[PDB]
Design a binder for these strands. Structure first.
Lengths: 61, 60
DNA sequence: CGCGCG
DNA sequence: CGCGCG
């Protein structure tokens, strides 16, 4: 987390719809999905986001 | 190849099947992540094998 | 290649 | 909790 990145993540998914972790990271200047996954799963635990297990895509809920 | 693999082999040979954490600490390192790259690299070459139940690596 | 895991 | 992942 660095630092309110979850806010940026939230804006991207809100404006671009359901996207995989790799696309989210690249849209924020990062390289791999590992750079944002701990954030995504932290937001998911707080019911901010949710992931479709089939498409591995993250969306706002 | 990277000499460390030879050291992992000797440890498993003398101490028997061990989990990745034990192997790493035996070679001076801290976590399993420090040796997992070598382990699976040796597995693909059929040097080692991991018991999926106990997660212990052995000579195969 | 899914990996979230500290 | 397996995770090797670049």
């Amino acid at each position: 987390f660095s630092q309110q990145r979850e806010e940026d993540i939230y804006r991207f998914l809100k404006d671009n719809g359901p996207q995989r972790a790799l696309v989210i990271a690249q849209a924020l200047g990062m390289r791999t999905a590992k750079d944002v996954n701990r954030d995504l799963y932290r937001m998911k635990s707080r019911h901010l986001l949710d992931m479709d297990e089939q498409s591995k895509a993250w969306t706002i809920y």
